[PDB]
Design a protein around this ligand. Sequence first.
Ligand SMILES: O=C(O)/C=C/c1ccc(NC(=O)C2(NC(=O)c3ccc4c(C5CCCCC5)c5n(c4c3)CC(=O)Nc3ccccc3-5)CCCC2)cc1
Ligand SMILES: O=C(O)c1cccc(OCc2ccc(Cl)cc2)c1N1Cc2ccccc2C1=O
Length: 542
Amino acid sequence: SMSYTWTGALITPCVYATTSRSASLRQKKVTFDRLQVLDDHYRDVLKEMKAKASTVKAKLLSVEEACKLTPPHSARSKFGYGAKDVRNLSSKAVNHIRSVWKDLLEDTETPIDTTIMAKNEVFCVQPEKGGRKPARLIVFPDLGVRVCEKMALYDVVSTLPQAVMGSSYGFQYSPGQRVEFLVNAWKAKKCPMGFAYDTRCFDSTVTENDIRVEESIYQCCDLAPEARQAIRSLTERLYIGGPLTNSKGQNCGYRRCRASGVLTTSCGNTLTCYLKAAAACRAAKLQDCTMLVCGDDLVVICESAGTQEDEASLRAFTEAMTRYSAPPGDPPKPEYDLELITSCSSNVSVAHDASGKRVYYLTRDPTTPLARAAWETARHTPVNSWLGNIIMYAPTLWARMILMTHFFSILLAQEQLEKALDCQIYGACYSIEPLDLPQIIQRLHGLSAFSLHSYSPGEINRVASCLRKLGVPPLRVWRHRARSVRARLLSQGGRAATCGKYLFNWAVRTKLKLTPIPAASQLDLSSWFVAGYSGGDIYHSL
Ligand SMILES: O=C(O)/C=C/c1ccc(NC(=O)C2(NC(=O)c3ccc4c(C5CCCCC5)c5n(c4c3)CC(=O)Nc3ccccc3-5)CCCC2)cc1
Ligand SMILES: O=C(O)c1cccc(OCc2ccc(Cl)cc2)c1N1Cc2ccccc2C1=O
């Protein structure tokens, strides 16, 4: 069937920001019929996955627990209440949620309505490698339905992926754990070869059968009867497909593929990508595979069979993925250096700690992080990508020297060091106080994140070239600015002094011997690197 059907009604509104004006261009790309052919490899992997899902015991969340996971600025319900009413457990909000839950238990077939919208994302004007990328489309059900999804499936999507995929489940890893996983996988092979596999419009390639197969995996959990019925009804009425309504309440058409804004998007995508890829690995006869899956993002590390054999095994892997309805965007290329693999937009790099000991860390091209941070300094945004980049890329040269320096100077000037800010980590929203950044960084990357040096010539040149292209002052200016930011922070004592001492130790003439932060141990990061929730409408306050 057609991934989408369009009435022609417009997807109306809610260096450059992506808008609803480019929606037509995205719609054309994501609209196609799917041809899927399953085989024995696919069926074998599925049974193996279900056998692992069978160990999971999932709990039904109470209305109250589901309400607390709702972001304060989550889209308002069309039934007369908003995210604040949900969080406060208001009568109107709660009564409506209960009527939605009751309807899921009673009605097993009627499709549930969804809103289609163009996402507003910031990208950098690259007139060299073509032009502007069209807006991604977000498809999501009403607030009432989203709270019900949490009651039925929050525990499932949070526990089942790890139980099924084990060490292959990418969302269980902090940045420090992810780099360690990739390094260990690479070092475990006699002659390693790795590749990233990019699926063209993954959500659109997800068939109705894939969504049912995905439910068959959920159904292996020990579940409460109402949770079991809610999952059965949500699959049939929402996950497999449904009608699309624009922001003006006009009918846009229909969807028979993955909705990007449902609780199960990340879990469903990860399970589907893993299933198809593990089966394709067997079809291609790739030897001693290690996979790392994050939604539609896949990395494979295996034993090289020779350069021509590897090129042949990758074409075979691609042919199998195509049969499973997961054709590629760019065709995959074998890599023989771990650093040359880009996965989840990141690459492994090496640096040294204070004692000259080798330290692996993940980095990326800083153009998009810098452009987005420039947009965020210019104007207010719901999520602060600068903060998530400081958190995730804390050991990088660019995040330490530019992002930490710039934003700490703004926070000092505005006296907003104590003001909690929202940021996204693996699709979940976190309200974070910037004064807590040293404790966060020590926990995710280790104490050495504050003492890294001997950055590679390639990394230094990529950062330096980027600054020049974007009209950002050179590294020497940042060192000078960080010294002043640091001095002001030190003079304040408490957490502010800790930010100064730890975050800006790279800036000083004579580096201080840094000791572990005592408050870092008592920091509750239990919900941080457990699962992915892209489009899942999840919130946590640290
Ligand atoms: O010795 C040498 O050879 C050169 C010396 C030199 C060169 C330029 C300066 N610039 C400045 O002082 C000013 N801008 C900045 O001091 C500045 C700071 C951050 C900037 C950022 C981002 C960096 C990441 C955090 C958010 C802010 C961007 N741009 C920045 C400029 C340049 C800019 O204007 N916009 C963009 C656009 C896209 C991406 C980045 C930028 C402030 C007043 C006058 C302009 C200072 C010294
Ligand atoms: O962007 C996403 O939603 C996303 C999706 C899949 C896998 C990811 O991380 C996988 C990874 C883990 C650690 C590192 Cl150092 C890089 C990549 C994602 N990341 C990347 C990111 C960078 C900065 C702020 C937040 C996020 C975030 O959530």
